[PDB]
Scaffold this active site. Structure first.
Site, PDB file in Angstrom:
ATOM      1  CE1 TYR A   1      -0.780  -0.985  41.117  1.00  0.00           C
ATOM      2  CE2 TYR A   1       1.061  -0.027  42.353  1.00  0.00           C
ATOM      3  CZ  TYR A   1       0.569  -0.637  41.208  1.00  0.00           C
ATOM      4  OH  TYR A   1       1.441  -0.879  40.162  1.00  0.00           O
TER       5      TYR A   1
ATOM      6  CB  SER B   1      -1.779  -3.709  38.135  1.00  0.00           C
ATOM      7  OG  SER B   1      -0.667  -4.086  37.338  1.00  0.00           O
ATOM      8  CE1 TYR B   2       2.378  -5.447  45.443  1.00  0.00           C
ATOM      9  CE2 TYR B   2       4.038  -5.661  43.698  1.00  0.00           C
ATOM     10  CZ  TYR B   2       3.630  -5.854  45.017  1.00  0.00           C
ATOM     11  OH  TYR B   2       4.497  -6.442  45.904  1.00  0.00           O
TER      12      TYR B   2
ATOM     13  CG  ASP C   1      -2.914  -7.092  30.683  1.00  0.00           C
ATOM     14  OD1 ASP C   1      -1.818  -6.521  30.451  1.00  0.00           O
ATOM     15  OD2 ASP C   1      -3.565  -6.923  31.745  1.00  0.00           O
TER      16      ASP C   1
ATOM     17  CG  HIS D   1      -2.318  -3.678  32.687  1.00  0.00           C
ATOM     18  ND1 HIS D   1      -2.618  -4.852  33.338  1.00  0.00           N
ATOM     19  CD2 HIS D   1      -1.660  -2.908  33.587  1.00  0.00           C
ATOM     20  CE1 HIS D   1      -2.161  -4.797  34.578  1.00  0.00           C
ATOM     21  NE2 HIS D   1      -1.576  -3.625  34.752  1.00  0.00           N
TER      22      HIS D   1
END
Ligand SMILES: *[C@@H]1O[C@H](CO)[C@@H](O[C@@H]2O[C@H](CO)[C@@H](O[C@@H]3O[C@H](CO)[C@@H](O)[C@H](O)[C@@H]3O)[C@H](O)[C@H]2NC(C)=O)[C@H](O)[C@H]1NC(C)=O
Ligand SMILES: *[C@@H]1O[C@H](CO)[C@@H](O[C@@H]2O[C@H](CO)[C@@H](O)[C@H](O)[C@H]2NC(C)=O)[C@H](O)[C@H]1NC(C)=O
Ligand SMILES: *[C@@H]1O[C@H](CO)[C@@H](O[C@@H]2O[C@H](CO)[C@@H](O)[C@H](O)[C@H]2NC(C)=O)[C@H](O)[C@H]1NC(C)=O
Ligand SMILES: *[C@@H]1O[C@H](CO)[C@@H](O[C@@H]2O[C@H](CO)[C@@H](O)[C@H](O)[C@H]2NC(C)=O)[C@H](O)[C@H]1NC(C)=O
Ligand SMILES: *[C@@H]1O[C@H](CO)[C@@H](O)[C@H](O)[C@H]1NC(C)=O
Ligand SMILES: *[C@@H]1O[C@H](CO)[C@@H](O)[C@H](O)[C@H]1NC(C)=O
Ligand SMILES: *[C@@H]1O[C@H](CO)[C@@H](O)[C@H](O)[C@H]1NC(C)=O
Ligand SMILES: *[C@@H]1O[C@H](CO)[C@@H](O)[C@H](O)[C@H]1NC(C)=O
Ligand SMILES: *[C@@H]1O[C@H](CO)[C@@H](O)[C@H](O)[C@H]1NC(C)=O
Ligand SMILES: *[C@@H]1O[C@H](CO)[C@@H](O)[C@H](O)[C@H]1NC(C)=O
Ligand SMILES: *[C@@H]1O[C@H](CO)[C@@H](O)[C@H](O)[C@H]1NC(C)=O
Ligand SMILES: *[C@@H]1O[C@H](CO)[C@@H](O)[C@H](O)[C@H]1NC(C)=O
Lengths: 728, 728
Positions: free
Chosen positions: B509, B592-593, B670, B702
């Site tokens: 992450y 995501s990240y 998203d 998302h």
């Protein structure tokens, strides 16, 4: 030789196939661009003279991508700054050059972002479309005169088509037709006010912080359609202080009665115009020949001058009704229509009589009428050798239909079986264009005695390069399906070893009136597959295919996704029996309608195909446009054909995809088959617990045609296939 | 023999981890849903009684999604027709049930499509948001009184947050706060008039013929932000023929001077409210404590009651500044802030004095303040054993900060190293929630004696089930990078043999203040990968990670995509040298990240990773939202940080992807990390001639959370991984 035709060779076009494009400007002269400059060749002798030196190209802005010389040869249009829109439409900038004064017109220039422009048929008037409105310029150096004031982006189109007329009706962006002597300018106006908008994101350059939403009036099956108005403008009265003199011609009552489309416009004489209309259902069309009434300026129609064409078993024409070809006097015309036997042949009509007389006949079809003189009619047909995938030029005597000679059949029989032609103004001369099965060959002929005259391009250079590469061989043959002979072709790997079992890839299109089997020479992805990867690539034309009569073409009427899909499976099954085919490694792929058929075939649970690739497929007919979809499927209502729309979706076959490896590919900016179609298909497969692969192509349209996307998609599909076939 | 933990086990949740969710309603009673009955438990003696029989739910005639009992216990709200919007927002229908007369209120019902609703903290008043406006209902059977009239879709939000405040500031949709005794109702109004709209297609059910375009006011980096106003409504005067009595509280001048955010609201007493504001730059925040002036109705601010918090090395707080915890009288408060050594600790503030005294200190951090009484303060920290990934409940004596006790550290030392807690009113009792490393354990305790009273849920059911399966083990340890020790975890396959070489999957992450290495027990995709496929799955918290002080956390300030990416590469390099790692099979994945870091790592060209999977990755910071992005990167202007924005895109590293196998996944709907991010990334990879794989998920957001998409994405990723690792 010990090297093959590689993927790189295909993608980089390392082997150039040459052609010869010319523009006839008289009965014996044509213009040709040789080494950037425009030469004026004389057909008769071949004595070429410079008409426009190269270098005269001062890279105005960018690069001139096209030219057009006024009929009186006094001016020439330079087209540059090309900006593509849809399949045929684009905008561009235009410079007018004076051939006399050999000066650039510098005042009253053509606007930037011009949608369409054309010289009148005689002299040098200009008519162009800008911001959806029409403008006429009598003289290049004089200011233009505005013709329409209703133009409005995405709403009102004057002189150019809206999305659906461009793609499905006209196969062109232009909707302006000058009369023979330039007195009148006819144009259509399209009103998309009530047509729903398809909307999709366009991402643009990486620098654009927020994506753009593209909106296009696009009528899906059963939706509100654009409406059309056809006008004839008398350009004689055009003046800044004068109104525009125009007359709207409406379709005959039998068509005006409901939704309809304008599908053809043919000027007959300066005072007679032929309009071809078709009902929205597209199984009833009518030609209306209107005469100019000098005393009132009206264009008059009469029941005696109307000609109806209907289809009780399908739709009219191949994709639209065939166009009428009038005699100089306009008292009669020739036009391709379906035989009593279902074959498309040339019929002779009297302009004011309802019965016509067929001048050609047989279990084969006329593809198109190319030229007509007071004594002969030149046409293209697939009569030769009974092969529907071949094309030849023929001439028939107008006063004796017994006298019909084939002009191209025997010129080069083994190298050339598929031709198209281009005739000079009075059919005195014609260029023959041979596209295969051998390397393309361009030649010039005189109608007098059909003398070969000379070779324009024989691709000798390509021939030399190819003798060094292990090229695959292309074979055509027939197979019997349900008592009918259908054609197929196979591209076979070089040094074919009959003792080996080769994986097979079926390349399919199969849409109504389609033809995937022909004798055209192509350096394609399949060439690479066979030459370098040793994969046999086959194609088959089954029910619904064209150029073989209506019985075969109309077989899929109101039932798309049935017989043409089933015939691909059955034909492949036959192909799989051949000892040299590895039946455990058969794949199928296709683009657009072919993506749809590939998907339907993969969802058939036939057990024949191991994997397949669908590129930009239709997945549900209700998502496609009205004109195309309704022509073959009627309306999606319970009173009409909703039942067959519902069980012909790919999604209805989702569960069967668990049996195959599938690759679904689609461009996100596809304005034609919307990304929506694949988004809904993938969603159904996800819902059914089916695994598969996808590849979206950001901002690519229906052609996934940008240089890098083109290379990327074929490279990706190649890897998918090798993986499916356990090929290193 | 023994069955392993399979993909299906994970996907279908065959092994159920139980929990114990209770709602404290007094200093010694809590409600708990058991067998669908709402039970009332007495902590004092462990006895219970039925609060609402489940027969009642049977009588409602709809699936009840949730319920909320009024504080005076006379009414209960029933939530149904739940429709999710973003991460926290959703709309619903609500019924009010009278517990006294046990009847459903049928008059003056709460509107359908209600956006937010809440009881007052005492009694049974209701405040709710509908169509972006606030309404107050003094009685369940009485008509509601409208409070605001400016509510407008996509423009003005009263009482609820707009997109960015919901996601990045409040982590909640609600923007209303009743005062302790229900006298006042504070709310925030957000104005998105100038905020650009992100637009994307939503396909919906297959029957929808035309896709819809979703539009959301969403400020991307550097764009125009929503503005906010804060009001306190005096509800005592609400009446149908009375205007609304309200007062707008503006931020202190040091924040009012430019763009800012309201990031916190804390009621102190009925006449004192604490507002926390932060400048758009997010390295300067201020708490403004306003007092009600009974003679004028206004809320007065004073420089003496303002407290500034800044950061010179990065931003303020973890994701937002920590919230103040006020004493019952409101004369002082406790709040977590970074100390002189860069570690976040509890500081004691006097409401009207600027200097504070730290009550905690050390090379560890306080996670949060849980409860406060006149004598003690309870908090959670990762002090125990000095492990940043552990959490324990401590109690500190307010009169002598040196007297600190750990209440959870030794309860079950091997089973429980990560706790959260929930205190009753006045902190008389607390529920301890142990999340790992062993199976979750929920217990109840008395604060007066710290006796454990009882076990609420020990997961004995799950424990049993797991003995028959070959579960993997989770090991935590440290390594040194650049002279700093960092933590990592490895999920090891069963029968882990030191000798054998195993493929390695790095799950990442790594966003600012992230923590992927902890002692929480989880049944995850990683569990399956280890148990069944024999893959080691590791995670590493490097620079930029949280809970280890500011030196570590702020290391990536203004430089996202640098050190946190580099540290993942270095840690992995060290892992591959541990002898039990097959360096020929190392992969990395994240969401995501984590998708951004996975992509940046793959584009680093380190030769370390064979393949990687990025799910809904950020690809370019200018595409992400302003609040989050600017917090760590400043503004994308040449005057500020444009240079580091420019070279931290995944696209800037496209060329290096030719050396790896990549799978890019993104949901088309998203609303957070826009599909645009992956569409622009794929476009750059295509332009660079990089082959890779893709998978879009139609209409998924998302979370790619629908039941079918969740099963589909993990199945797809497993196949990709196994193919990358040559695992059958
Ligand atoms: C409405 O409330 C009643 C309670 O008055 C519920 O009855 C209870 O239902 C649960 C759920 O099945 C039963 O628990 C079971 O216990 C056995 C232990 O032998 C265990 O093996 C199962 O896993 C489960 O935990 C419980 O015995 C039963 N109690 C009574 C009083 O009968 C009822 O289920 C609720 N109705 C609905 C539709 O929610
Ligand atoms: C394009 O077609 C629309 C109808 O779809 C025309 O709009 C109508 O115009 C008349 C006259 O102004 C109004 O009375 C109607 O109410 C309009 N209908 C609708 C649905 O708007 C429009 O005039 C046409 N435009 C042109 C230039 O032909
Ligand atoms: C849609 O349904 C029709 C009717 O059930 C299908 O047509 C039948 O197809 C079977 C082949 O399995 C034939 O044996 C029948 O003779 C057909 N009946 C009719 C009425 O033609 C049709 O194939 C289905 N379409 C799709 C795309 O699956
Ligand atoms: C963007 O460019 C900056 C400046 O060149 C990079 O920062 C350098 O990173 C290298 C590699 O770690 C170090 O050797 C230098 O000390 C750094 N210089 C500075 C000025 O900090 C940065 O790594 C680049 N960002 C990305 C994501 O590639
Ligand atoms: C123009 O024509 C000459 C021959 O007449 C040719 O050599 C020259 O390359 C041409 N200029 C170009 C390349 O446009
Ligand atoms: C060709 O030569 C003839 C003379 O034989 C001449 O009259 C004619 O203009 C020439 N045309 C071209 C295009 O060279
Ligand atoms: C047309 O109108 C213009 C108005 O400026 C005028 O100058 C011109 O003379 C008119 N045309 C003629 C000559 O009648
Ligand atoms: C044309 O098709 C329509 C169906 O849309 C039908 O109602 C009509 O009968 C057909 N007409 C002919 C000539 O087949
Ligand atoms: C528990 O017992 C007390 C008396 O000791 C009683 O007042 C209370 O109501 C009981 N609670 C329940 C839910 O049984
Ligand atoms: C919202 O802000 C706009 C300017 O961005 C302003 O014109 C408008 O008055 C504001 N609306 C309200 C209700 O405050
Ligand atoms: C409020 O005013 C309305 C008249 O507009 C009246 O019907 C109602 O009785 C009044 N209520 C109060 C609070 O007096
Ligand atoms: C806060 O950030 C701004 C803009 O990035 C900067 O000018 C200022 O120096 C920072 N304040 C502190 C105390 O670091």
């Amino acid at each position: 030789s010990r090297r093959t035709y590689t993927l790189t060779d295909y993608l980089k076009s390392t082997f150039r196939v040459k052609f010869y494009t010319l523009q006839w400007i008289s009965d014996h002269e044509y213009l040709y661009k040789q080494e950037n400059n425009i030469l004026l060749f004389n057909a008769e002798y071949g004595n070429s003279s410079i008409f426009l030196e190269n270098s005269t190209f001062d890279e105005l802005g960018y690069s001139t991508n096209d030219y057009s010389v006024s009929p009186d040869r006094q001016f020439i249009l330079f087209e540059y700054n090309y900006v593509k829109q849809w399949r045929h439409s684009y905008t561009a900038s235009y410079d007018i050059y004076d051939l006399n004064k050999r000066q650039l017109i510098t005042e009253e220039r053509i606007p930037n972002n011009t949608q369409w422009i054309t010289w009148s048929p005689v002299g040098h008037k200009l008519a162009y479309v800008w911001n959806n409105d029409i403008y006429v310029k009598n003289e290049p150096n004089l200011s233009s005169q505005r013709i329409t004031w209703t133009g409005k982006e995405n709403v009102i189109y004057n002189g150019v088509t809206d999305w659906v007329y461009e793609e499905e009706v006209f196969s062109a962006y232009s909707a302006l037709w000058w009369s023979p002597n330039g007195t009148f300018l006819a144009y259509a106006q399209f009103n998309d006010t009530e047509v729903p908008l398809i909307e999709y994101s366009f991402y643009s350059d990486e620098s654009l912080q927020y994506p753009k939403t593209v909106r296009i009036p696009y009528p899906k099956a059963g939706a509100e359609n654009p409406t059309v108005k056809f006008f004839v403008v008398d350009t004689r009265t055009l003046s800044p202080n004068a109104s525009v003199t125009s007359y709207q011609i409406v379709p005959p009552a039998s068509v005006l009665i409901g939704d309809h489309y304008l599908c053809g416009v043919t000027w007959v004489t300066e005072e007679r115009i032929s309009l071809q209309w078709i009902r929205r259902a597209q199984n009833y069309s009518i030609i209306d020949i209107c005469d100019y009434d000098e005393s009132t300026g009206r264009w008059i129609s009469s029941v005696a001058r109307q000609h109806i064409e209907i289809s009780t078993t399908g739709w009219v024409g191949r994709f639209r009704p065939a166009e009428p070809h009038f005699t100089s006097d306009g008292n009669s015309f020739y036009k391709i229509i379906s035989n009593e036997e279902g074959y498309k042949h040339i019929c002779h009509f009297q302009t004011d009589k309802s019965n016509c007389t067929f001048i050609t006949k047989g279990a084969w079809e006329v593809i198109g009428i190319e030229a007509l003189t007071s004594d002969y009619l030149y046409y293209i047909s697939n009569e030769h050798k009974g092969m529907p995938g071949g094309r030849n030029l023929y001439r028939i005597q107008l006063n004796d239909y017994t006298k019909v000679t084939c002009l191209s059949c025997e010129l080069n029989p083994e190298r050339c079986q598929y031709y198209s032609a281009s005739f000079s103004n009075k059919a005195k001369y014609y260029q023959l264009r041979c596209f295969g099965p051998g390397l393309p060959l361009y030649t010039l002929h005189s109608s007098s005695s059909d003398k070969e005259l000379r070779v324009l391009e024989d691709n000798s250079a390509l021939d030399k390069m190819l003798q060094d590469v292990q090229m695959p061989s292309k074979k055509l043959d027939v197979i019997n399906l349900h008592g009918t002979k259908f054609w197929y072709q196979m591209i076979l790997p070089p040094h074919f070893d009959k003792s080996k079992k080769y994986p097979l890839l079926i390349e399919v299109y199969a849409g109504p009136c389609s033809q995937k089997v022909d004798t055209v020479f192509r350096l394609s992805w399949a060439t690479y597959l066979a030459s370098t990867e040793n994969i046999i690539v086959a194609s088959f034309d089954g029910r619904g295919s064209g150029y073989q009569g209506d019985k075969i073409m109309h077989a899929i009427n109101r039932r798309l996704g049935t017989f043409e899909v089933e015939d691909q499976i059955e034909a492949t099954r036959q192909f799989s029996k051949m000892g040299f085919v590895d039946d455990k490694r058969i794949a199928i792929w296709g683009w657009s309608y072919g993506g749809y058929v590939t998907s339907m075939v993969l969802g058939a649970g036939s057990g024949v195909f191991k994997c397949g690739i669908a590129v930009a497929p239709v997945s549900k007919w209700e998502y496609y446009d009205s004109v195309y979809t309704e022509r073959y499927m009627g309306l999606p209502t319970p009173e009409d054909n909703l039942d067959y729309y519902r069980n012909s979706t790919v999604m209805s076959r989702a569960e069967n995809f668990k049996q195959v490896e599938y690759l679904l590919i689609h461009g996100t900016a596809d304005d034609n088959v919307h990304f929506q179609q694949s988004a809904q298909l993938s969603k159904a497969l996800v819902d059914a617990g089916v695994d598969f692969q996808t590849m979206w192509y950001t901002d690519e349209d229906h052609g996934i045609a940008s240089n890098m996307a083109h290379q990327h998609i074929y490279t990706h599909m190649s890897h998918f296939l090798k993986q499916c076939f356990s090929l290193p």
